[PDB]
Amino acid sequence: VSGLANGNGATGDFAGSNSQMAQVGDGDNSPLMNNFRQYLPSLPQSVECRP
Amino acid sequence: MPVLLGIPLLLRFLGFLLVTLFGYLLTFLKKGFGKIAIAISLFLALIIGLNSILVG
Known part of the structure; x- marks a missing residue:
């Protein structure tokens, strides 16, 4: 239960949730919340000012 | 106080099991x-961790 939170891993009966907890993620990168990023509205960029 | 030949050893043993079992509960x-x-x-540690991301 400590290894499914530290990110060290779990061996036993808690060995199925080691692939469910890889989808959650670690830090800022989350495989689950990066599925939403192929569908982001395309906003224009920033260029210098022309009259 | 006269007793039979095996009673004093039943009484010493019934307090060996108790100390052994009360020893496990401690552990x-x-x-x-x-x-x-x-x-x-x-x-x-998870709190101190989030801080370092956000302030960056």
Whole structure:
């Protein structure tokens, strides 16, 4: 239960949730919340000012 | 106070099992107070961790 939170891993009966907890993620990168990023509205960029 | 030939050894044995079993309960108590040490540590480490991302 400590290894499914530290990110060290779990061996036993808690060995199925080691692939469910890889989808959650670690830090800022989350495989689950990066599925939403192929569908982001395309906003224009920033260029210098022309009259 | 006269007694039979085996009674004094039944009375010494019924207090060996008790001290052994009361010895195991102690071992397990101490283990469970170690879980609440791991738990607290974890929580405070996840807080200190988020801080370092956000301020960056």
